[PDB]
Amino acid sequence: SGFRKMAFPSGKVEGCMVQVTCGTTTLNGLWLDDVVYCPRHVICTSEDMLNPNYEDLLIRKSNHNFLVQAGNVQLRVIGHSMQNCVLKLKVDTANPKTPKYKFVRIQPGQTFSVLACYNGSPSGVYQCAMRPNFTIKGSFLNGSCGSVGFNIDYDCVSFCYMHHMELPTGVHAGTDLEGNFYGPFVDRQTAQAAGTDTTITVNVLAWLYAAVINGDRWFLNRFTTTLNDFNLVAMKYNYEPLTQDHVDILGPLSAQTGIAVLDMCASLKELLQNGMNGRTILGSALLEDEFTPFDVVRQCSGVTFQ
Amino acid sequence: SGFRKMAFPSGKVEGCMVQVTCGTTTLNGLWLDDVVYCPRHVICTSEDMLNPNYEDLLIRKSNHNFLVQAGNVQLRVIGHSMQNCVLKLKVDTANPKTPKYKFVRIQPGQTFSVLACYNGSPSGVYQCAMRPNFTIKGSFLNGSCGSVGFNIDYDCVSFCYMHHMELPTGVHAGTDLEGNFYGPFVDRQTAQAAGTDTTITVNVLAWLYAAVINGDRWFLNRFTTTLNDFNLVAMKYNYEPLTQDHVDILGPLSAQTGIAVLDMCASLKELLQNGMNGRTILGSALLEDEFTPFDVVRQCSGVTFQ
Ligand SMILES: O=C1CC(C(=O)N2CCN(c3ccc(CO)c(Cl)c3)CC2)=NC(=O)N1
Ligand SMILES: O=C1CC(C(=O)N2CCN(c3ccc(CO)c(Cl)c3)CC2)=NC(=O)N1
């Protein structure tokens, strides 16, 4: 029993984190095989941050301008190239702790674990979701750029995020591991703002199923709504509309509890219109939307990893 | 910026988790040097759980009754002994991934990271606090016994908790690594209940300082209370009393924000008597008490580990 914000074990990722220094700028890099991945703005100075020309800045650099450290061992850079907003540093030594990995781009609403690092040293791990406005509500300080987000499928590490910058509203933006930004953001210190965020409805429903599994049932009722009558109320409260695919994803949770998806939607509709009236659900007084249906199944059924 | 439930990187602990089987019972073990630590109830059957005599049960066992697996490698048990509620299995191979470690017993109110495991395989990591009633609000399923809690100081792993059982109210109880239970619990399936829980006041104050650092200031005021006038209100709402040592611990947070501790206590006193009125603090509609003053400093100043 119980329900926690659970992150993946970070051991397989800790061994891939390195320190990358170019000039007086130092951030984190991802060392896989003989390639080190890091944000390309590591080659920027104070004069370039507002209007950088990464083509010019990179052409004026050589391999010896990049200092890469794996703990105390120095990695000799034997080549460099730029793929979108990510810099790829070819090194002479292949990382012997390279796990089975792949590069995946996630969708809004999906969750992943973040290994926050500083000077190539892991500092902490936490779970977060990609928001519908393509930002994440992370916890990052100065020097955290290059920190990566990941999921673990069986024995394979799926890298999905590399941290690049913090927006003025305190939220964070980054790219996938191919260098392509999540959302309409660019890696230059211009006045960029994120669009309006919305609540991930399918995640709230999955979180309500986790509550029923753990004994919280006070919000239930015997009513039933349709998918269109629910979406009319949901859009009023800035909730993402619910689709038939979302219903099918919630299948296993509905079977384990014996509560149909449209039944639970009627309970969520009541919680949106009347509030929670000082009561709590799984120790929260707000509706949580950063647990996917898979996160609930994994935590309420117990699947490990190799 | 930002504030998350952040756990320690679990890499150094993942390499110490093994699978321990005795009869038809399988749980997790901690492999440090040539010793494997696991809960002693692994030697119990169905007939013994309600009234076990661990002296008799252990004397009727031999070294070959214990099957220890580190992944696929089998560890030959060359000796066994019992220290309080923990079984110590001497094996022929010393764990080459043994980090610098120590065994520490934590106090109520302190936090630690939990590496939840099943069949010796890590499944997830999360942060939790030792409650004033010596339980933890964990997330554990069947087979999680032997999972350990830990903190990381510099390069040293401080083990502080080993999971033993879940109580009927859904909370969890365990021992330190010397086998001594936290709280008045025993490892037999009798009807045990935890005492009344209270809110960790010093942790709430530390969490309020984290909010001010991150831009949440709506709850502040210019009033100031005394330590005794605050404790009179706190005990009314089942809050732990505040001591002068708690004030000194909050020193660095008060200096960084320029808000005295007694000033913040006046704000907490108002939040307890009037509620939050539908407003949120750091994305929560409740007062969070599972962040220590050290957790806030570490996340709002960025200290890594070796
Ligand atoms: O999330 C964070 C990250 C963070 C941090 O280390 N930064 C801020 C972003 N910065 C940067 C430099 C150049 C360019 C373009 O040349 C860009 Cl776009 C960004 C690197 C240093 N500080 C925080 O406070 N929070
Ligand atoms: O936290 C958890 C742990 C858990 C779990 O694996 N257990 C439950 C406790 N159990 C046990 C066996 C014998 C004795 C004394 O002989 C005792 Cl005290 C406990 C071992 C198996 N299942 C859950 O659902 N939650």
Swiss-Prot record, chains A, B:
Protein activity control: Inhibited by pyridone-containing alpha-ketoamides compounds 13a and 13b. In turn, alpha-ketoamide 13b (tert-butyl (1-((S)-1-(((S)-4-(benzylamino)-3,4-dioxo-1-((S)-2-oxopyrrolidin-3-yl)butan-2-yl)amino)-3-cyclopropyl-1-oxopropan-2-yl)-2-oxo-1,2-dihydropyridin-3-yl)carbamate) inhibits SARS-CoV-2 replication in human lung cells. Inhibited ex vivo by michael acceptor inhibitor N3. Inhibited ex vivo by compound 11a and 11b.
Span of domain Peptidase C30: 1-306
Effect seen on changing P132H: In strain: Omicron/BA.1, Omicron/BA.2, Omicron/BA.2.12.1, Omicron/BA.2.75, Omicron/BA.4, Omicron/BA.5, Omicron/BQ.1.1, Omicron/XBB.1.5, Omicron/EG.5.1
Reaction(s) the record says it catalyses: TSAVLQ-|-SGFRK-NH2 and SGVTFQ-|-GKFKK the two peptides corresponding to the two self-cleavage sites of the SARS 3C-like proteinase are the two most reactive peptide substrates. The enzyme exhibits a strong preference for substrates containing Gln at P1 position and Leu at P2 position
Cytoplasmic topological intervals: 1-306
Active site feature: H41, C145
Places the protein is found: Host cytoplasm; Host Golgi apparatus; Host nucleus
Record note on what altering C145A does: Complete loss of 3C-like proteinase nsp5 cleavage
Annotated crosslink Glycyl lysine isopeptide (Lys-Gly) (interchain with G-Cter in ubiquitin) location: K5, K90
Self-association state and partner proteins as the record states: 3CL-PRO exists as monomer and homodimer. Only the homodimer shows catalytic activity. Interacts with host FBXO22; this interaction promotes the proteasomal degradation of nsp5.
Protein name: 3C-like proteinase nsp5
Organism: Severe acute respiratory syndrome coronavirus 2
Gene name per UniProt: rep
Range covered out of full length: 3264 to 3569 of 7096
